[PDB]
Structures are given as structure tokens and as C-alpha cells.
From a paper:
The design of proteins that bind to a specific site on the surface of a target protein using no information other than the three-dimensional structure of the target remains a challenge.
We anticipate that the binders created here, and new ones created with the method moving forwards, will find wide utility as signalling pathway antagonists as monomeric proteins and as tuneable agonists when rigidly scaffolded in multimeric formats, and in diagnostics and therapeutics for pathogenic disease.
Residue numbers in the entry:
A (entry chain D): 1 to 55
B (entry chain A): 36 to 231
Amino acid sequence: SVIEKLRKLEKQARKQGDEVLVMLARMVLEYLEKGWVSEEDADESADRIEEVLKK
Amino acid sequence: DDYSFSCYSQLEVNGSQHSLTCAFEDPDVNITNLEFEICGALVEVKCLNFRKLQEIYFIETKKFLLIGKSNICVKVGEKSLTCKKIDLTTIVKPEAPFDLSVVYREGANDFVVTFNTSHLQKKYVKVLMHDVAYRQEKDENKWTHVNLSSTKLTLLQRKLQPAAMYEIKVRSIPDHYFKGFWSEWSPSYYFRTPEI
């Protein structure tokens, strides 16, 4: 699930103190729930967030 | 591609408004009949038209979703000549740093290089990598480049030539979720190293 990946990333970014990534993971979750973005674009965006968190 | 182009975005360049600048990769391309259009990954509207400004194409708007790819097309009236799928968060060009300052401290035998960036007060493109470049004024093609993530760089007195004129400047690139291009250079700062 793309939605569960994003809620996991938001929590990890809060713990790491990355406010830009907390805002971005929430924005992607919000746009996906509204049907504003596709699951494909939300998953690629989550992969980018996860890569920044790994650094 | 005869109508080959490239673009850069500037996020929160004018308050919450973003900008998008496109240009043909070949500068001799005649743009008399050519118009630009962006469709997709926009907030309320399906498509937006670019304004033709002498040699570049420009849009300043808040209606960028900033998630998903947009289609930028070159048109002759209603006919599309070429289209390109671009993610606006991967073509960001930061604003140049400003207020560059160099100070020499005798007690520490070092140069403290400081500068400012409007990106520290933004919501999106907040995280940059900076490039501080310096050279002895007399030299051509002999710049030394140093990367940093903060706005303060310390150079040791022993790492520079003594009794010499130096030129120093700084630029930034997005280094986080946002990717893109190097900003314009800040204006140069000139200083002289101590005689030792």
C-alpha cells in the first residue's frame, strides 16, 4: 500500500527533524486521497522522500 | 529534434507564486510562429499559455501542483510540433545567493566567508548545496570550488597565496527532494590576503 508507505515516511521524517519531508509526505497523502494525483506518481514521490531520509 | 527545448522552474520566486522559463536549445531558432503551452500537474486548470519574451518563454503562477509530470508543447497555432513530459520539481533553478562577505581574523589566521539566500525562508526549496569558487585575480581557468550546506565557510590563511588579490563568488543547487540546476553566481567579492 502506497498510503501506508507515506504514513511511515511522515513519521520517520518527524523523528529525523525534516520538516520539508513531513510536509511533502502529508501533501502526497492528501492529493492521493482526493484523486488529484495517480498512485504511480504518489509511489515515485514516496521513493524520492525515502531516498532523502536514507541520507 | 528541430524544436528541441529546455526549462527551469523557480519555486516561490514571488511570494507563493512559482515561475517556469523555457528556451530552444539552439539560440538561432526563429520563434516568430512558435508558442508554448503547459498541460497537466496544474491545480484548477487543464492548460496554461506561456508569454513570449524576446528570446525566452515565461509563466509566473501559483497553479503548479508540484507532484506529477506536466506536458510542455511547442505549437504553431493549434498544431503541436513537439512535446516533453517534465516534472517541475526536478528542473528547479535556485535564486542566487547575495550579501557575500569575507573577513580575515588575525587571532585564528583564517578567512570567514558568509552569504545569504532567500531559500532559508521558503517552504519548498529550502535545502541547497552551495558552491563557493575563488581564484587569484591574475589567473584564468584556475578557480578552486568548495561545496557546503550552510552559509558560512572558513578558509585557512595557509591554504591561500600570501600578499595576493583574490576573487570569490557563490552559487546554489537544490539538494534534497528537489533537483535542478546551479543558480546564477552572486556578484564577486574581492579581498587581499595578508603579507605574512
